[PDB]
Structure 1
Amino acid sequence: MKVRPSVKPICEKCKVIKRKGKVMVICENPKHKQRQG
């Protein structure tokens, strides 16, 4: 995953959520995983 201070979608299958206070993007492409909103 990518820990970056600006998480945002990269394609159309990626969608944004919040876990434990962290903003995250989860996708069906494992390249597109991000956290630390």
Structure 2
Amino acid sequence: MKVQASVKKICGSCKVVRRKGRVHIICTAEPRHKQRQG
């Protein structure tokens, strides 16, 4: 995934999910849209 300080949606299939206090972007359409904050 991309681990960066700025995580946003890159398409309409992107989803913001928080787990363990951390913000993730999960995208069902584009697996290179997967992001973690850090």
TM-score (norm 2): 0.88
- Alignment of 1:11 with 2:15, yes or no, is no
More strand by share: 2
Gaps of 5+ in 2: none
Counterpart in the other structure of 2:24 = 24
- Alignment of 1:36 with 2:37, yes or no, is yes
Gaps of 5+ in 1: none
Take 1:32 and 1:15, find their aligned partners in 2: how far apart are those partners? 10
Two-structure CA RMSD over aligned residues (Å): 1.1
Per-residue Cα deviation, 1:2-34 (whole angstroms, up to 9, x for no partner): 000000000000010101011000001111000
TM-score (norm 1): 0.90
Task: Give the number of equivalent residue pairs.
Answer: 37
Runs of 4+ aligned structure 1 residues displaced above 2 Å come to: none
